[PDB]
Each structure stands twice: as C-alpha cells, then as structure tokens.
Design a protein around this nucleic acid. Structure first.
Lengths: 98, 96, 79, 206, 151, 127
RNA sequence: AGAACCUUACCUGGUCUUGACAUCCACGGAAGUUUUCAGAGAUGAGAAUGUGCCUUCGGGAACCGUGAGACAGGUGCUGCAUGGCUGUCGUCAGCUCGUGUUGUGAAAUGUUGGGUUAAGUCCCGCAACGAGCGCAACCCUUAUCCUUUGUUGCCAGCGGUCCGGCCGGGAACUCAAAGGAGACUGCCAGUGAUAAACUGGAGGAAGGUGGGGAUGACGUCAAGUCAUCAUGGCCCUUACGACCAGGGCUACACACGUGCUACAAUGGCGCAUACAAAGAGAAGCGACCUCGCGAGAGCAAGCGGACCUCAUAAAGUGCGUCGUAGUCCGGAUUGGAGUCUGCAACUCGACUCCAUGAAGUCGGAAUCGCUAGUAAUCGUGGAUCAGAAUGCCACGGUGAAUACGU
C-alpha cells in the first residue's frame, strides 16, 4: 500500500530523512505508525594488510546496512500530494513495494 | 601490470557474449536424458576462450590475479589504498 | 568412474580415427591432445602421444579402450 | 613505516564522506570502477586547476560529483565554457545523466592535497626541499591551522642514500579520534627519483 | 603473577550432595570440559564405594581422601649454581587439591573396565592402602627429611 | 496484575512470570522434569528459590530461547530474581549476598587475527 | 582469499615482428553478425549479406587490413637508488624540541630524587620554566535501565480455535536499531608528608584504565615487497616481447616446520530426543514433491530477503550393544563401480557406493600456548571460487585446573 523500505550506510543518515517524511505525512494526513528500525545486516570483510607476507597483521573491514520502514496507514489523495519529491536524496535507495 | 595479460582479459571477457552466453544455450537442455545422437558434443570445436569461468578476475585498476573480492571488484592492496582514502560508502575500521 | 554418460573425445582426433579406417592405416599419428579416450575402432591402429618432448609410439590393444591415451605416456622424466 | 592513515581512521568519527552515494552489492563492483575512472581523467584536466578534493554521488540513476578547488576561476571559466566539456565526459564515462557543483576553497594552505601537490610540484623545479617544506611551515598559525606537519621520504636533494628528515610544528594529535585531521599522500615525478609528500594538518579539537 | 595478587574465585557446590569439595573433584576428572559425563562417573564411583565398604556417603570419600593427604612437599631453589630441594608444609587448600589429583591420576594408570569402577577401586583401597595413589602420596616423603637441612 | 521479570545469561533471554497460585512449573509449554534438566544445572532454575519459605507458594510461567543448556538455565536463574519484584527490593537485601541478581558480564570472546580462537597463538618453530 | 585449460611467469614445440595492448602518418575497407575446407591450435586461403549517424568532394569519428619509421611491451635486473605499504623489538613507555641554566667543549639539566600507577599516570620536590609526540581520554562492541518505533519480530491479559501466533487482537514482553541515563576513587572507613595513591566496605547489572577490539611514539634490523601498483638507472627488442597447444608448478633414496585424524570404554556403533549464534543468497541459494542405498538427477514454490532458501547443528541426554584385543579401536593404502562442475578430470580433483583394512596401543632429548567464559573439547557460516579446505577468517555450545612467589 504505502509499504516503504530504504537502506543507508552511515550510523545516522536516514534518521533525519525518515523523520521529515513522518511530519510531512501525519500533519496533513492521519495515522502514520512510524519508522520501524529493522535488523542491520553487517557485511564483514578481512584482507591481508601488506603486499608480501605479514599475514599475522590484517586490517578488518565492515559495511553496515541500516534499514527503515515508515508505512503510512492513511492513503489520502491530499497526503500523497505534497509528499513525493521531498526526499532530497542523499544516495539512499527509496523503494515502495509489498 | 603486464598489459598483454590485461589485454588477454579484454579478449577473454568479450568472447563470452558471442560464442557462449547466447549460443551456450546449447549443451544446457540439449545434453540431457531425452528421447542418442552425438553430434551435439561435436559443436565444442568453438575457440574456448569464451568459457563462463575462465577469467581469473584480475583487479580492475592494476591487474593483480590474487586477493580479488567480488563485492569491491578489486585486489586487497587496492582495496586498502582506496579504503583509507574513503571511496567505499559505509567502510571504516571494523571492531566489535 | 567419471565423465557421466558417453565417453568424451576431441573432434580432430575422431576424424583421424575415421581416416585410418576409410583411407587405411599407414604410420603412427602424432597427436597433441591427451583428452580423448581410446575406442574399439582404434584397436589395431598406431598413434603417438606428446608429453613435453616428443610423441611416444603407443600401440592400441583390446583392454586399453577403458583407459585414456595420456595414461600410456608418463610426462615427468625420472632417473 | 607502520601507521594508520589519518583520513580512514577518522571516517567513522569526524568526516562527512569521501563517497556520499548508496548502492547495492550487485551493481557495486562496476559502480566502484566508474568512481576511480572519472577521478583518473578529472585529476588530469584539473592538474593545473589545483583540485583539493571531490566527492562522488549517484542520486537515483544520476551522478553529481561535487568538485572543490583552490582556483574557482580556472575551473568555472567564462560563463559555462570550461564546465560544459567536463560535465559532458562525466556522463559518457558514468553512462548516466550527469550534474555538477562548484565550491570555493578559502585558504588553500589549509588543505592536505593542495599543500602536498604544491610542495611536490616544486620538486620538478629543482629547488631546495628544506625551503620548499619551510614555505608551508612559515604560514601555519598565521591563517587557521592550530597544528601542521610535513614529511618527506627517500632521495633528499638528489643524494645517493635515502633519508627521511620530517618536520613538525604546533599540535598534531594523530591518535585523538575526535581531533580534526586533514591528510593526503602525493608523489613526485622528478628525473632524480620519487619523493613521497605526506602532510598532516590539524584544524581543531571538535 | 608478579605484581597482581588474585582474589581466588569460588566455584559453586555439588548439585546433588551440596559439597564444595566434590565440585573440584568432578573438575579434575572432567576432560574436554564435559561436566555431565564427569559427574556420571563420580556418582557411580561414590555409590559403589559406600555400598561395598558399608559406610556413609560423605565421609567415605573424605576419610579415604584424608589417608592420601600429603604431609609435606619440596620446592626447587636454583640459587648458588646447584639444585636444592627445600621441604615445605602444604596448606589445607593445596593439601586436598593434590589428593584429588593423585586419586584421579592413579585411576588413570589402571587397566580396568569403566571409569566409575576403576576410580572406585582406588577409593576402596584408600582406607587400607595397597594401590598406586597411596604409593604416589608418599614419593617426596623419602626425599623429605633428608632435605631438613635446608630450612 | 502479573509479576514479570526478564533475566539473561550468555545470549540466552528468558521471560519469567509469577502469580499467587499453584507450584506447577511450565516452561515453553512443558514441565520441569520434561525440560530435561537432570545433570548439573538441574535446579539452577530454582537456585534463587533455594533460601525462601515456599512449600508451594506461586504460579510460574517461564520461556527461554537462545544459547544452550546451561545458558538457558542461568537465564531462568537470573530471570526469576527480577520476577521477585512482588516482594519489591526488601528480599533483595539478602539476595545481594547470594549474587543471583548479579548479571554475568562473561561473554564468549571474539576470534582474533593470528590466533586459533581468541587466545591460542599458533606454535612457532624452535628458536 | 584456493596451479585440472585458463590462471601461469617456467619448459618442450609450432608461429608473429611497428607487433596482444596505446598515440600519430598514409592508404583501402562500415563495423559486424553468416558459413566452408586445412592444421593440435595460433591461424592463413574462399564463397554470404551488409556499406550505418557528418560530406563546395583533399575527407570525418567508430573499427578493420596493409606498409613505414618514432614507439609500444617486459611477473627482466638492482628493496645495498626509491615511492607506497608492512613485520619486529612493543601496546614496551618512552623519545625530543624551545628559550634559561651548567661546562672550555662532546653534552648535561629539563626527562637525575622521594612516593605512586597498567603507563614519563599523577603527586611532592627540583636549576629550570613550558610545550609537543606517545600513554590516558574521545570511537566501536558487550553488561543494565529509560525513552522513541511495532512487521516479516514477539504472545502476557482476553475471547475464536483445525493446538500451528495461526486469526482477531494486543501492545506488554523478548528480539530489533536510533537517541539518552548509568562508573568519577566519589559516597564511606583505614593507611599515607595532611597531596597523589592505595586497601576494604556500601550501593549497583556493571568498581578502581569493567571485558574485548580498534588504536602501534622517536627509531632499530641497509628487515620484507622493483612480483600488485608507481618509479631512478641498467639490459634484451624479427627477443628476456607476443600468440597457441601440451607439459611443469602436484616430481621422490631424503630432513624439518605447520595442521588434521588416531591409538578408544570420559569411548565405538545403532535407535530415539533437546538446546545456539553469526552469516550467505538473483549468471544465486533451492523448498515441497518424485526417482536412486548413496553422490545427485528431473519436476519445481518463495525470497534481492527479521518473511523464503541453504539449515535436519554437534557435544549432551534416554535405552541397547560392544567389555580391553591391533578390537565393532583406527582409518590409510589399493581394487571394482558411480555422481558433479566444465571444451575439458590420465598426468592432476571433489564427493558417493561396494570391498581391502598399512602404521599406530600416549611417543626419545627437547619443545608450544594459555589466567575464566580462557585452556580444552564439540559444531556452524563466510570470503576465495565454475568446480577442490584438515588452511584461513567469523560465530556459538559445554566448560576447567593452578597462580605460595620473582
């Protein structure tokens, strides 16, 4: 319906983007349950630090994938207007699907 | 990093769409328990360098044939050189 | 053991085997490919298997059909 | 020479980004190719322009590339004379609709890459490294920069043996995570050898 | 253990009988960190001990272990370019510690069927002494008294 | 109203409930003897109920997941002590001495580079 | 972080020499998708169609063939010319600069002392007064609570029930990720120059840098890396380049290291049964279902993923059997017969079936690690990758012994 799901890399990026979408929706419309935090998948990589030998020292790498789910419960024609194209995208992949 | 073997990659990768991929639909359903005729396996006189897992997957910048990661598409050294200069979003010092 | 249904061989050597039947056998055929298995039609014929120096004159026999061409030519020189 | 790189260590703590974009693991590998490929050509065309640093992003099947510079006049030019040809080739390499931004870097002596490129470019002139390094030192506390230090390594003054002979002034806390540290590595293209220029700059505590 | 002196952390008591002495005992026998298979041997040994001898549960192994308590032990010096063994009185914490070890180590040397049985055999011969632990308890005893000089 | 307590022990999280009724044990819709707790850590679930006047005092419903046999048992051990809030923090004063309200900070150690599992440095050749 | 071709450099052969790859000149040809014959292949020699976006006619940009020199190429040489990166002493607590002073000067002082700390930590003292690197702190994760949010997560009070959180519902709770509180020798007691600090107690989930990671000073070993890359110089250049096929890197009278698997009744075997965490997955992971003893095969949902798939975790536990033997220990080696990935499994594989069942019964001098959720032991996942882990990285289960002392 309005089943939204995004993904951001930094510990706090979406928190302001998924904040502004709430008061855009709940002010003009109604309901709007709010941003569900969801589990963060963290893809951990480990590779050899030196070009030759030196396996005993390695630098560990990680990429955190932070999810959010808004889910506006009120699909009014007033609230769907003046909401889209206020995303001001900082990279984050917006997706609207079941 | 030995531009010949890197040029040999450009040949090897570019052959994968012509001789195989499309025409490698042959041998998939064809070489199977059906109905035999052995003329299907006589189509394997093709140049061979198109093979689906023939590339070493050298690093995209340098061309090291070692420490390649499928995620970044680069070698561990060029991962670290880049990683310390940022460039990979969400990448930092891992500790937990 | 391996190779599932059907014994795998190369195309160029299959023509060489059929050449020895149709045109008739003459001398040991010098072949670089070691991938092709021996067949019943290859019994009686002469071939030569390359292995990093020169083609070794290997003779085909009844019970050699089960094994490969490259088994009869050891690559690594010892002693 | 065993040290953590000041930028990378401070990415999690106190930097915005060197790449603000988001992407998925499937297209990530070919996406990272285009990020270094554009910068390879961009550094060539902005060689005389004195580029400090640029930040790539891809907002939903597009590409921005926010470019900074010490000299905005050489990058911008008359109207959109210089920017139109830059933005054209960025769209061709990326294979997508390309935007572009401009950002004037006040006080070019406060950036790492600008000072590193300024000091290393003087090596092709064949001047004294002691003075060339001291020219960056002489104006440290004058305009900004609560601390700053410069290192060179190997082939000093066309010598046979290779020394280091680094130099430092002010306060440069290399292991204080909250401390703002600007750093970038650069190399020389001189006929007498390759000297690497490392410059650590300290702006403030928070 | 040069600067830092530990607080000697206390293990929990035996879950059936409640004896903190047997909590250390099961842990000596415990190999591969298996407490469940360790105690199963311990109880099966202790049940066969008190049944055969016809004594009570807690004081069967205690009076048994009291016979295998070492009086004194020795410590190697290495000071003036020679090995000197100096005899010292083992404290009650270390007294039963070596006792439980040498019972389990003596039962380990036996060639009998089960661990419950072979351990119980050494517990059975603890009160009246023919076995290997009761031989092992006074090994240094002969070396001691000869080293009464160094004190 | 119900008398709730959480508790946990080495990534094993329990959810304890207490009431005034009968002393039948119900864990994950299963009995205490049918909760397989026969060997050491048999009565660590009722370790916080060792030194109390009970006979057959309270209903108890508990539910633990995560970790193993002993970790889940210590989650029930620490969980019941939080559920003693029916008697507020008056009975805690004696329970502080026992150290059952004390939550175990000991967690399994991470695997480290050049080490077999968290500590063991792999042996080197002679000198 | 993975030599069956490829990789791959090295070898034996077959070939090419402005070249496989990049810029420039001239010249003809759209590129290219079609096929045949010969050769192991690199490849040369034919027959097809096509001839496309700009052109006062000399042409363009893509790409292809030819020829010409400038060059291109070099995993070749020098880590005793270097950049970059890194091991190690060492996560040891040190190492220096300013002025000032001391000495004729090298230097010293500072940073010599007395206490104290994990620590050049802090205190007092001081011919030095200050600063800076390093330590500490700031970061991440974990121990606890509060607030924000309630699906795919979760199920307590309620009814409906096919006894399945499954369907209303319920928002508590666990779980989940955002922001906060909480641990500072401070509250108290004793000692201590009355200072720092120390020892103990109270509170608290967590007390004396809480636990772990990240974090590695000035420098040493002309330590490693010209082989990832970059690069000075040198050298080869119809060859030390380039392409192809097969071979080698996997050899076998030897020596050592690093591991797995054992020698077993804390155990083997068979049946039944309970309890995890962290991941991965669209050129993918594969239910359920059917076939085969099995490796897998055919059919074939859902899920770009708290949903669906890999995934039925093992130790453990309940019975039975085995009862001290080279054995129901142990699994090697070898034979016969299969599957899978892939042009391809002989050199040179993984895995399955049947059969064979070496050595080995706790191992010589000596030697390696570890102080608590650790040693030990038992499983799982990932990266690499078409396909090959006992390695490596990551995760959890159960879980000790002993620290008198330098």
């Amino acid at each position: 319906r309005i089943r939204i799901r995004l993904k951001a890399f930094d510990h706090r990026l979406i928190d302001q983007a998924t904040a502004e979408i709430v008061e855009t929706a709940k002010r003009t419309g109604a309901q709007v349950r709010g941003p569900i935090p969801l589990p963060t998948r963290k893809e951990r990589f480990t590779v050899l630090i030196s070009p030759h030998v030196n396996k005993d020292a390695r630098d560990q790498y990680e990429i955190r994938t932070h999810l959010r789910l808004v889910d506006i419960v009120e699909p009014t024609e007033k609230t769907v207007d003046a909401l889209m194209r206020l995303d001001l995208a900082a990279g984050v992949d917006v997706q609207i699907s079941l | 990093a030995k531009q010949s073997m890197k040029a040999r990659e450009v040949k090897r990768v570019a052959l994968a769409d012509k001789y195989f991929a499309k025409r490698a639909e042959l041998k998939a359903i064809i070489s199977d328990v059906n109905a035999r005729w052995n003329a299907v396996l006589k189509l394997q006189t093709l140049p061979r360098d198109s093979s689906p897992s023939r590339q070493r997957n050298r690093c995209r910048q340098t061309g090291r044939p070692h420490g390649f990661l499928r995620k970044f598409g680069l070698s561990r050294i060029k991962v670290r050189e880049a990683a310390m200069r940022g460039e990979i979003p969400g990448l930092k010092k891992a500790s937990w | 053991r391996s190779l599932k249904k059907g014994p795998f061989i190369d195309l160029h050597l299959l023509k060489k085997v059929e050449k020895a039947v149709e045109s008739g056998d003459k001398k040991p055929l010098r072949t670089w490919s070691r991938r092709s298995t021996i067949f019943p039609n290859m019994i009686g014929l002469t071939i030569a298997v390359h292995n990093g120096r020169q083609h070794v004159p290997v003779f085909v026999t009844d019970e050699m059909v089960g094994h490969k061409l490259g088994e009869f030519a050891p690559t690594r020189t010892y002693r | 020479g065993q040290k953590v790189h000041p930028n990378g260590i401070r990415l999690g703590i106190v930097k915005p980004w060197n790449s603000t974009w988001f992407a998925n693991t499937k297209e990530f590998a070919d996406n990272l190719d285009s990020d270094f490929k554009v910068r390879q050509y961009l550094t060539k065309e902005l060689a005389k322009a004195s580029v400090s640093r640029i930040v790539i992003e891809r907002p939903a099947k597009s590409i921005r590339v926010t470019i900074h510079t010490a000299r905005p006049g050489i990058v911008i030019g008359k109207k959109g004379e210089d920017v139109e040809k830059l933005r054209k080739v960025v769209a061709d390499i990326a294979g997508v609709p390309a935007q572009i931004n401009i950002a004037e870097v006040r006080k070019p002596e406060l950036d790492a890459k600008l000072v590193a490129d300024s000091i290393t470019s003087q090596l092709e002139r064949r001047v004294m490294f002691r003075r060339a390094m001291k020219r960056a030192v002489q104006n440290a506390m004058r305009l900004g920069a609560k601390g700053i230090k410069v290192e060179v390594s190997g082939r000093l003054g066309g010598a046979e043996i290779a020394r280091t002979e680094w130099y430092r002034e002010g306060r440069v806390p290399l292991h204080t995570l909250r401390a703002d540290i600007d750093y970038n590595t650069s190399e020389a293209h001189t006929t007498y050898g390759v000297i690497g220029v490392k410059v650590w700059i300290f702006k403030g505590e928070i | 253990p040069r600067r830092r002196v530990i607080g000697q952390r206390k293990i929990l008591p035996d879950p059936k009988f409640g004896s903190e002495l047997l909590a250390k005992f099961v842990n000596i026998l415990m190999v591969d960190g298996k407490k469940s298979t360790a105690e199963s041997i311990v109880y099966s040994a202790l049940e066969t001990l008190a049944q055969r001898s016809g004594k009570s549960e807690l004081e069967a192994f205690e009076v048994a272990l009291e016979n295998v308590r070492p009086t004194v032990e020795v410590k190697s010096r290495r000071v003036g370019g020679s090995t000197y063994q100096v005899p010292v009185e083992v404290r009650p914490v270390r007294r039963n510690a070596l006792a439980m070890r040498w019972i389990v180590e003596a039962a380990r040397k036996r060639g009998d069927k089960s661990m419950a049985l072979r351990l119980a055999n050494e517990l059975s011969d603890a009160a009246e002494n023919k076995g290997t632990a009761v031989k092992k308890r006074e090994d240094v005893h002969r070396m001691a008294e000869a080293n009464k000089a160094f004190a | 109203n119900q008398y709730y307590g959480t508790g946990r022990r080495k990534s094993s999280a329990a959810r304890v409930f207490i009431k005034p009724g009968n002393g039948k044990i119900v864990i994950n819709q299963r009995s205490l003897e049918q909760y397989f707790g026969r060997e050491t850590a048999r009565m660590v679930v009722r370790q916080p109920l060792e030194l109390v006047d009970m006979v057959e005092k309270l209903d108890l419903y508990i539910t633990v997941k995560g970790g193993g046999i002993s970790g889940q048992a210590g989650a029930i051990r620490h969980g019941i002590t939080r559920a003693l809030m029916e008697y507020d923090e008056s009975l805690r004063s004696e329970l502080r001495k026992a150290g059952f309200v004390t939550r175990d900070a000991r967690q399994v150690e991470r695997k480290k580079v050049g080490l077999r599992k968290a500590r063991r440095r792999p042996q080197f050749s002679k000198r």
